[PDB]
């Protein structure tokens, strides 16, 4: 009857607690009007589209390809300087990659997020796999976050985070 | 410096200034020292000259003209000439709307609701008023709970 | 559809076109348009009332 | 019949005496059009923030937080040289305290939806001081006198210092009429 | 029987089950958490300081032939190739993970309910009698602790003096 | 008549739930009271809330003075975490510490054990100078109001 | 006071007249004390 | 000054096309006429029966679309 | 009545078995506080200003080598200061608080009625073990007196530059 998330607060009719990451947030009701397993689809690869993103703003600071050892260490600088025909490769394999899941979510039904990727096997443990569900939903969460800081960090100071921090300018001047 | 000076550094800003200040004391110089007509001059070029003070420190960009133009493009560093103001209205708007909404309904839940839109009760409609502050939540509240958008089949349409 | 229920018009050239009404009485003598329905919205001639056939009106939950 | 306030009005017909401070008094009957129950909540807020206000005006005279910034004996101009930063996370953590203490009720249409929400009543004791029911009683009283008296004394603590353009304990040591 | 604090109450997860349970739980982690997890975690930092200080004694006096000796044990790490101290890293996770049988998270690491702290090591069988077996619980437990606290000792130590923990001990100066 | 400002949804006709939750009378310190799941109170009472608060103190006291103390130049010297390197990290030679998270050196502030250290301490400015409620050297409202009823126009 | 006069009060244009009013005034007084805001300052 | 009457120039589109598409969608039938079609494109009006119905047609929608087509080209 | 103000009615947060117990409340804070909590405020107290009056007497009379040397002969609260820029008081800070946790819980077991207020067991020597009511009294006696005798040795030393014993010696 009550939110886990927000005590005081009703809980949500669509979220009753069983979906994986499921405290029974939603103080704005979207689940009322969206659907919940297109949401938890979207929520998902969000979520992975930022790990991946908040590990990359980081990893360029600590080591380079020896191709790209010339791009910044501010991964939007190197955005801008890396040129049009290796983002256009990246767009390709990124494309034929969300082939897979325009196919799953407009022909087909599954998991919110079951692409059938699990080449080592480390979802057969049903406890194990309820765990890295809802591990894989927060930690994107948390990388969805830290990510939007990030872009924005980097906006503000023009350097990388780990530049950022060092230089200890954590403090804005204005706007851009 | 988008496509245009700043305004703090421009020689037909200053030539603009000069005039207005000339035909104000102009004006003034037929007028005995002390007499309102006097003080009501003085107090228009002191207006005149902090207007065009704080312009030239505004960082406004001033064109051929002389005059200040407005880049409302998005840019962070012109916020403050169209998109903040924006900012301001869409929240006041959006309050006018969002509490007029709400007394219409609770006007249509009534005995008379002809009556209650023609002679309003203040009482209600305040306590409304005082509601639109956080509208763009309650707005979008009332959205997902589905009670704002109505259905296609509940609304009278023409025929075809 | 029976006495005081309210009901939702289905007819297109009507001025309630999916409008709710409440329906007055219905006449079983095997007139055309049997059921009559009061609205509190008046029409453009100043009518709130008019007479329907049950195949123009669906009962509201 | 007549108010006990003011004797010759009428005695305010919404309010019934069982509020704490309840002389009768509300010769423009406000309370007849807005609920007393809102009035007594708005009551309680304006008088705890004027308890605090006065208190900090009159403390933060006297004893500062380390820096330029922060000394300032002067109220008004304390809240320039305070840093603005500061300030606008101060009024941040206000917006959420009144949203969280509110429980997400902070419109007249749902203030009092629960019939448990008592006017002033945040669920605000954290040493459960207010447990007592022998002294409760007195300490509503004394709390709803105490935000009235810190009312008006920020009120005059704000206004004589727009006057006399300095601190309230620095004007009444060293007073100097007004002059024009 | 006696209780580490007699002012205070024994705590009621404590029940004298695990080896050297005084009633030791002022703040009461035991009540939030998993005592199992809190039992292996504490007897995985035991064992790690154990070997610490055996290392920080040994490091100083002899070092290995292929590696740099630096001034202190704290400064050998620094002085060793970071390769080397990369494939520690690696194998110390592979162990991890193969000992925990790839059940390294709490809501699987006891799915099969084992022993906290029993990861099947007894290569000498030194484990075999049941009281010995008490025993050296015991003895590892304390042990463990002490260690713990004998390490951050001699880590913090030799931070400050920049002198081995022996070399201090006979060149003693106050630090101020 | 209708009395505005009611707080009751229902009188505006506005949505508003049909059975609403329960006052139960739990309190934690630095917490509040109102509807809590089952054993909140119990499991994250006053106690916790004390207990962490006091944990959490313990630990400000080594992170206020946070940084690397060394006698190996004879005296007791203070360098920042920042300064040392680390090896296996690429070109981050210097990484992020404790420092990143209490950055106290860069504003300027000097933390102690307790909250404020000798560089950063509470100003206490006494008001009252040498100023005397009547008959001092500094011109009270008292004696203001004296001073006006002995005047001579 | 007379709730009839109240009603009167109450009345659409009186209220518009006296709101529009108030909101003129809000804003005469704004450009009195803050003149000559072409832009929000920052 | 080029942007100002641009945007002006931009109500006369809309405004013109505002007209003309209402009187295109609603030439076949409105809640005042839901029997448009029958009277054809260009019928006089309906009478002052339902509180007026001047201008009722697809056919004047088109004689207000030429004032305000004349006043953008304008 | 209340024994110590025979016209004032008892308080009634006041049975009067605690240790020091003489109906001594005319403000009534006991109305307001937890009579547990004041309990153990007052035994905290007690404890300390003993320990802090104890302290400067042996100040005055002693001081430890090489303390004399970091402080540079100051006294009381100078002493606290420069002694605070040595990193002493630090040190104590530190393990005042390492006990005040434990003496969080403590104080949360006696609000619990677990724990009888400011009763640590600690009594190695076992000399509460013959009349511990008697030996309670005493202790609460001479904490007030020890409260108020830091008071006033604080507060000479804030007048004269001077510690409790050296300023008794001039005056
Ligand atoms: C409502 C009901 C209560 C009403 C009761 C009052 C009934 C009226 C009786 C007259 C009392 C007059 C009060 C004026 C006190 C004053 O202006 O107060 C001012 C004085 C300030 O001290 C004076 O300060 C003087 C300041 O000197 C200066 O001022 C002097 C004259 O002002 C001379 O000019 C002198 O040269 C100049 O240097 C002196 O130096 C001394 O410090 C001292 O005489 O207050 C003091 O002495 C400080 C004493 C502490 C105040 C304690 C009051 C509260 C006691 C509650 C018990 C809890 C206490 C704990
Ligand atoms: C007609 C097309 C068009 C449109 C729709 C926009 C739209 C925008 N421009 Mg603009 N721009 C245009 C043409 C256009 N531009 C042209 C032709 C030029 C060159 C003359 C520019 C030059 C320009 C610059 C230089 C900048 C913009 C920026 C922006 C963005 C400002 C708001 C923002 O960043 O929100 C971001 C905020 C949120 C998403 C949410 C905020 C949440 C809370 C409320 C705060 C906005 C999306 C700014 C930007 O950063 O764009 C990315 C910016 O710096 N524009
Ligand atoms: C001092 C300057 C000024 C003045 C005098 C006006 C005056 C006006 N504006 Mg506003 N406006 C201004 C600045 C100003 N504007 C600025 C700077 C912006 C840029 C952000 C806008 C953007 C704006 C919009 C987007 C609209 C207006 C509209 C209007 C007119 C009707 C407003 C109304 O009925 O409110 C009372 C409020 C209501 C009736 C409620 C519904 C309408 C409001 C505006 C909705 C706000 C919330 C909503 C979610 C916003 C979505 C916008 C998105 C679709 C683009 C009115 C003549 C409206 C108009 O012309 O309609 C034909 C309109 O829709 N203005
Ligand atoms: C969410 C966490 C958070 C974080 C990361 C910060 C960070 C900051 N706050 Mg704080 N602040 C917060 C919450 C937070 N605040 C909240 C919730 C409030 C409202 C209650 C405030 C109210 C506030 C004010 C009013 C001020 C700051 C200031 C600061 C800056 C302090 C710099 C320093 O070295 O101080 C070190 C100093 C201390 C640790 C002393 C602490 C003193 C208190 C009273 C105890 C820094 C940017 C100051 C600033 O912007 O300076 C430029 C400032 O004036 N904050
Ligand atoms: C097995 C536990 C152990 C032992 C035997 C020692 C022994 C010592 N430590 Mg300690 N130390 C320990 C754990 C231990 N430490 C731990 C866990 C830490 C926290 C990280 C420290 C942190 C630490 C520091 C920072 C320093 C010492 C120092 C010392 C010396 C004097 C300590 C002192 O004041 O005496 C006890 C005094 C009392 C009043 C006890 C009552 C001494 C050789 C000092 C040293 O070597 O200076 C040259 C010194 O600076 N230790
Ligand atoms: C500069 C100052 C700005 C910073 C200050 C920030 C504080 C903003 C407070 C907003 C607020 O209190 O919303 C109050 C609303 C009440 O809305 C109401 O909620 C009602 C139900 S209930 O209240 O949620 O139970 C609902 O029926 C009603 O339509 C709706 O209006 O709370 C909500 O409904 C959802 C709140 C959103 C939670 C996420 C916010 C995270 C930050
Ligand atoms: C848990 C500890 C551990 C394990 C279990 C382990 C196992 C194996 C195995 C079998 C599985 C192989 C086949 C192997 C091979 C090599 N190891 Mg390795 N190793 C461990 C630790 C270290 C350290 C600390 C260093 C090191 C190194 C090298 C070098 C290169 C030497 C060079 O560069 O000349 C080579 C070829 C050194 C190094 O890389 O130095 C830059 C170095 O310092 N190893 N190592
Ligand atoms: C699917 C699958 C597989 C897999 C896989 C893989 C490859 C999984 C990869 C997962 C990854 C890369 C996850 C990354 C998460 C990053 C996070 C949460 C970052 C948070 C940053 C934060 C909070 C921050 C921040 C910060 C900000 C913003 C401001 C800064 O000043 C400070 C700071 C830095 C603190 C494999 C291939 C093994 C197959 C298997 O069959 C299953
Ligand atoms: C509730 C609660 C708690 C609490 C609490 C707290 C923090 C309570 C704090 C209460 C406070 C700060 C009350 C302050 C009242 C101030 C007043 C009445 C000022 C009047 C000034 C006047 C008349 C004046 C004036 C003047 C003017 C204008 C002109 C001047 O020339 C003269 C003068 C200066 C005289 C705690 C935290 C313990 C927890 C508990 O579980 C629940
Ligand atoms: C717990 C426990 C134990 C214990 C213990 C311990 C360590 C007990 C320690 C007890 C101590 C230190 C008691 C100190 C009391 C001091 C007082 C009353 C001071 C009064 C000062 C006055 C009146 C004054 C003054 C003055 C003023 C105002 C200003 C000055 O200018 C003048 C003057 C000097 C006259 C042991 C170890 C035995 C074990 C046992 O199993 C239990
Ligand atoms: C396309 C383009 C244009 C210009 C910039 C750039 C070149 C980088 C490029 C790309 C831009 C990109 C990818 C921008 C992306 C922006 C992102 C990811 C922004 C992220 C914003 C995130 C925000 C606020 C999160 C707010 C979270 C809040 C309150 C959380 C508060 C909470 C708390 C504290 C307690 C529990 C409840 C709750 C509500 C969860
Ligand atoms: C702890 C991690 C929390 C992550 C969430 C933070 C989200 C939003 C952070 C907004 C940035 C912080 O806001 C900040 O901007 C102000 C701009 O004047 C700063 O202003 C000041 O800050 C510094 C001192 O703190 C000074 O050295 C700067 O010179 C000064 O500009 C304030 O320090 C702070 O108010
Ligand atoms: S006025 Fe309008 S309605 Fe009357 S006749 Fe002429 S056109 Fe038809």
Redesign the interface.
């Known amino acids: 009857e009550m939110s886990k998330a927000i005590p005081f607060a009703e809980r949500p009719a669509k979220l009753d607690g069983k979906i994986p990451g499921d405290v029974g947030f939603d103080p704005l009701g979207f689940s009322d009007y969206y659907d919940l397993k297109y949401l938890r689809e979207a929520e998902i690869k969000h979520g992975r589209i930022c790990m991946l993103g908040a590990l990359g703003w980081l990893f360029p600071e600590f080591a380079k390809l020896p191709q790209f050892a010339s791009l910044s260490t501010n991964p939007l600088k190197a955005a801008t300087e890396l040129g049009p025909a290796g983002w256009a490769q990246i767009f390709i394999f990124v494309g034929a990659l969300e082939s897979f899941s325009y196919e799953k979510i407009y022909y087909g039904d599954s998991a919110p997020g079951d692409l059938g990727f699990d080449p080592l096997r480390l979802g057969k443990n049903p406890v194990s796999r309820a765990h890295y569900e809802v591990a894989e939903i927060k930690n994107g969460r948390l990388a969805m976050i830290g990510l939007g800081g990030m872009i924005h960090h980097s906006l503000l100071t023009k350097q990388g985070a780990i530049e950022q921090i060092m230089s200890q300018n954590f403090y804005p001047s204005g706007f851009p | 410096v988008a496509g245009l000076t700043p305004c703090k550094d421009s020689k037909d800003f200053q030539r603009r200034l000069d005039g207005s200040v000339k035909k104000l004391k102009t004006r003034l110089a037929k007028y005995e020292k002390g007499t309102p007509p006097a003080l009501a001059l003085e107090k228009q070029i002191e207006?005149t000259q902090?207007?065009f003070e704080?312009?030239g420190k505004?960082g406004?960009l001033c064109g051929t003209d002389g005059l200040?133009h407005?880049i409302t493009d998005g840019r962070?560093?012109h916020?403050?000439?169209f998109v903040?103001?924006g900012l301001?209205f869409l929240y006041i708007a959006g309050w006018i709307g969002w509490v007029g909404r709400?007394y219409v309904?609770?006007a249509?839940?009534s005995d008379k609701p002809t009556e209650k839109?023609?002679?309003?009760?203040?009482?209600?409609?305040?306590?409304?008023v005082?509601?639109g502050?956080?509208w763009p939540?309650?707005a979008?509240?009332?959205?997902?709970?589905?009670?704002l958008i109505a259905d296609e089949?509940?609304?009278?349409?023409?025929?075809? | 559809v029976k006495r005081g229920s309210q009901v939702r018009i289905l007819r297109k050239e009507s001025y309630w076109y999916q409008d709710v009404g409440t329906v007055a009485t219905i006449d079983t003598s095997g007139i055309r348009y049997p059921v009559v329905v009061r609205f509190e919205k008046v029409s453009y001639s100043g009518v709130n009332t008019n007479n329907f056939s049950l195949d123009e009106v669906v009962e509201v939950v | 019949e007549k108010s006990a306030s003011v004797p010759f009005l009428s005695k305010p017909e919404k309010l019934d005496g069982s509020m704490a401070g309840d002389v009768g008094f509300d010769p423009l009957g406000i309370s007849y059009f807005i609920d007393v129950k809102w009035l007594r909540e708005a009551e309680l807020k304006h008088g705890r923030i004027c308890m605090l206000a006065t208190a900090g005006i009159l403390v933060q005279e006297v004893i500062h937080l380390p820096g330029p910034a922060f000394s300032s004996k002067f109220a008004l101009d304390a809240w320039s040289t305070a840093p603005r930063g500061g300030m606008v996370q101060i009024l941040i953590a206000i917006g959420l305290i009144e949203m969280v203490s509110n429980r997400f009720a902070i419109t007249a249409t749902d203030m009092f939806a629960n019939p448990n929400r008592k006017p002033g009543d945040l669920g605000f004791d954290p040493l459960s001081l207010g447990a007592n029911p022998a002294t409760r009683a007195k300490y509503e009283l004394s709390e709803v006198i105490h935000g009235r008296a810190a009312m008006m004394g920020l009120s005059g603590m704000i206004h004589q210092m727009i006057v006399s353009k300095q601190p309230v304990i620095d004007q009444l040591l060293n007073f100097k009429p007004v002059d024009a | 029987d006696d209780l580490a604090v007699p002012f205070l109450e024994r705590p009621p997860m404590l029940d004298g089950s695990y080896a050297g349970d005084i009633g030791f739980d002022p703040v009461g982690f035991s009540n939030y958490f998993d005592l199992r997890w809190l039992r292996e975690a504490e007897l995985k930092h035991g064992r790690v300081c154990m070997l610490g200080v055996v290392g920080f004694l040994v490091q100083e006096f002899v070092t290995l032939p292929m590696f740099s000796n630096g001034v202190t044990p704290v400064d050998d790490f620094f002085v060793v190739p970071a390769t080397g101290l990369w494939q520690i890293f690696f194998t110390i996770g592979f162990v991890e993970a193969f000992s925990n049988g790839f059940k390294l998270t709490p809501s699987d690491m006891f799915a099969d309910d084992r022993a906290p702290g029993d990861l099947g090591f007894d290569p000498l069988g030194c484990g075999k009698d049941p009281a010995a077996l008490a025993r050296r619980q015991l003895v590892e437990v304390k042990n463990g602790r002490l260690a713990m606290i004998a390490f951050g000792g001699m880590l913090h130590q030799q931070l400050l003096t920049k002198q081995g923990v022996i070399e201090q001990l006979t060149n003693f100066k106050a630090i101020m | 008549a209708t009395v505005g400002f009611s707080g009751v949804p229902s009188d505006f006709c506005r949505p508003a739930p049909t059975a609403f939750p329960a006052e139960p009378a739990g309190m934690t310190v630095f917490g509040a009271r109102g509807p809590r799941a089952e054993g909140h109170r119990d499991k994250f009472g006053s106690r916790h809330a004390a207990v962490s608060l006091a944990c959490a103190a313990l630990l400000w006291q080594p992170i206020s003075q946070a940084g690397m103390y060394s006698i190996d130049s004879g005296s007791l010297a203070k360098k920042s975490f920042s300064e040392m390197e680390v090896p296996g990290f690429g070109d981050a030679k210097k990484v992020p510490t404790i420092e990143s998270f209490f950055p106290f050196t860069k504003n300027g502030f000097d933390a102690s054990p307790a909250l404020f250290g000798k560089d950063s301490m509470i100003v206490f400015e006494n008001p009252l100078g040498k100023c005397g409620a009547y008959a001092s050297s500094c011109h009270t409202f008292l004696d203001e109001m004296g001073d006006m009823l002995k005047a001579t126009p | 006071m007379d709730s009839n006069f109240l009603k009167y009060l109450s009345t659409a244009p009186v209220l518009l007249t006296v709101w529009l009013s108030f909101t003129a005034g809000l804003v005469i007084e704004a450009n009195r004390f803050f003149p000559d805001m072409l832009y929000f300052p920052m | 000054g080029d942007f100002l009457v641009h945007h002006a120039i931009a109500l006369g589109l809309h405004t013109t096309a505002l007209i003309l598409v209402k009187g295109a969608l609603d030439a076949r039938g409105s809640k005042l006429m839901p029997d448009k079609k029958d009277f054809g494109y260009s019928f006089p009006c309906d009478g002052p029966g339902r509180g007026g119905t001047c201008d009722i047609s697809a056919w004047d929608a088109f004689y207000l679309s030429m004032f305000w087509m004349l006043n953008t080209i304008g | 009545m209340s024994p110590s103000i025979p016209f004032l009615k008892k308080p009634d947060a006041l049975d009067g078995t605690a240790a020091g117990d003489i109906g001594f409340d005319p403000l009534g804070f006991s109305s307001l506080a937890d009579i547990k909590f004041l309990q153990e405020a007052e035994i905290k107290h007690c404890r300390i200003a003993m320990l802090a009056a104890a302290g400067s007497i042996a100040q005055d009379i002693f001081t430890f080598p090489g303390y004399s040397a970091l402080t540079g002969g100051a006294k009381m609260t100078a002493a606290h200061d420069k002694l605070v820029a040595t990193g002493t008081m630090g040190q104590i800070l530190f393990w005042v608080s390492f006990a005040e946790v434990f003496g969080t819980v403590a104080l949360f077991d006696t609000l619990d009625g677990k724990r009888a207020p400011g009763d640590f067991k600690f009594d190695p020597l076992g000399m509460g073990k013959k009349n511990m009511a008697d030996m309670q009294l005493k202790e609460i006696k001479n904490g007030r007196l020890a409260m108020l005798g830091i008071a006033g040795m604080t507060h000479g030393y804030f007048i004269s530059g001077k510690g409790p014993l050296e300023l008794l010696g001039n005056f």
């Open positions: 207006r902090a207007r704080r312009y505004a406004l200040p407005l962070w560093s916020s403050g000439e903040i103001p301001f709400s309904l609770f249509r839940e839109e023609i002679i309003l009760d203040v009482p209600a409609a305040l306590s409304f005082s509601t502050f956080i939540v309650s979008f509240k009332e959205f997902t709970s589905g009670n089949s509940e609304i009278t349409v023409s025929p075809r």
